[PDB]
Write a protein that binds this ligand. Structure first.
Ligand SMILES: C[C@H](O)[C@H](O)C1CNC2=NC(N)=NC(=O)C2=N1
Ligand SMILES: [Fe+3]
Length: 308
């Protein structure tokens, strides 16, 4: 049989009912494990994602002073690096995010405003997500230019560290790239490649995503920069990834897709994308080798996936 996959953007709503119910915030070694207030705060954000439905505006939340502080620290220390470490598409859009979305040290931007802004850039939109989606559902959203975005923030005791995605990582890491046309199309190709795809291949697509969307390096003229969200949201690894220590290889999907990695230390290896259009092409070609007895196309006019 062929695994189920949403045919319309509205059907993404089926995901919030298929997430991991026991999140990392419940682990003993989580920075906020002993903090019951944090625990309730997380549950509150999880309830917002749980009751969200496609088409609804995303609930605004008044962030506590302590939370705004954690964001300030992460924002200020990371910002100093972008001008020289982030790829062009990132820097080109960051100022706009600053003027129209409240990207500032003393303010945590609201997902609704960020979503509207991405919509006018590339049609990308966000939807609040409770916790970790399966790779199949997470990647599936991308086919509709939809990004499941966390809304809670890491625990204030360790501002420069998070064992999971949190809002600082979504906004400072992912958002600027989804504002770029080429990147938008490239990430969508990954989404399209995953629809109705067999599990073993979903894993391959997750690995490609890891080495591009999360930890990718781009070729910029004769230089190299970071575009991977996991890098753009990690002060330490962002500086390291452009140093002489890591090993760099050109993005090559048959190899990238089976390359192991661990999410615990700095990556020993990075793949360099020639450009987003090229990575997009490479995914399309790679998608062609996936055994699916059909083809898929997203029609932005109706927000439906066409199955051939
Ligand atoms: C895309 C790849 O499978 C990643 O490991 C995943 C899986 N599920 C996910 N779920 C959520 N909510 N956010 C993510 O960034 C995410 N990334
Ligand atoms: Fe991420």
């Amino acid at each position: 049989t062929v695994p189920w996959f949403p045919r319309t953007i509205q059907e993404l709503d089926r995901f919030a009912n298929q997430i991991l119910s026991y999140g990392a915030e419940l682990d003993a070694d989580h920075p906020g494990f002993k903090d019951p207030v944090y625990r309730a705060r997380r549950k509150q954000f999880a309830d917002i994602a749980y009751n969200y439905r496609h088409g609804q505006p995303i609930p605004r939340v008044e962030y506590m002073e302590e939370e705004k502080k954690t964001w300030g620290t992460v924002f200020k220390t990371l910002k100093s690096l972008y001008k020289t470490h982030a790829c062009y598409e990132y820097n080109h859009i960051f100022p706009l995010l600053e003027k129209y979305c409240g990207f500032h040290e003393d303010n945590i931007p609201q997902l609704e405003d960020v979503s509207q802004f991405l919509q006018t850039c590339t049609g990308f939109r966000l939807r609040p997500v409770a916790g970790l989606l399966s790779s199949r559902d997470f990647l599936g959203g991308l086919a509709f230019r939809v990004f499941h975005c966390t809304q809670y923030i890491r625990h204030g005791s360790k501002p420069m560290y998070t064992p999971e995605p949190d809002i600082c990582h979504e906004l400072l890491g992912h958002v600027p790239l989804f504002s770029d046309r080429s990147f938008a199309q490239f990430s969508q190709e990954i989404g399209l490649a995953s629809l109705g795809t067999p599990d073993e291949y979903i894993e391959k697509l997750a690995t490609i995503y890891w080495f591009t969307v999360e930890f990718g390096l781009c070729k910029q003229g004769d230089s190299i920069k970071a575009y991977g969200a996991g890098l753009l949201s990690s002060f330490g690894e962002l500086q390291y990834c452009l140093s002489e220590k890591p090993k760099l290889l050109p993005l090559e999907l048959e190899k990238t897709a089976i390359q192991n990695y661990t999410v615990t230390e700095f990556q020993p290896l990075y793949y360099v994308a020639e450009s987003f259009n090229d990575a997009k092409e490479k995914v399309r070609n790679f998608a062609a080798t996936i055994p699916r007895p059909f083809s898929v196309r997203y029609d932005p006019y109706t927000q439906r996936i066409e199955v051939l």
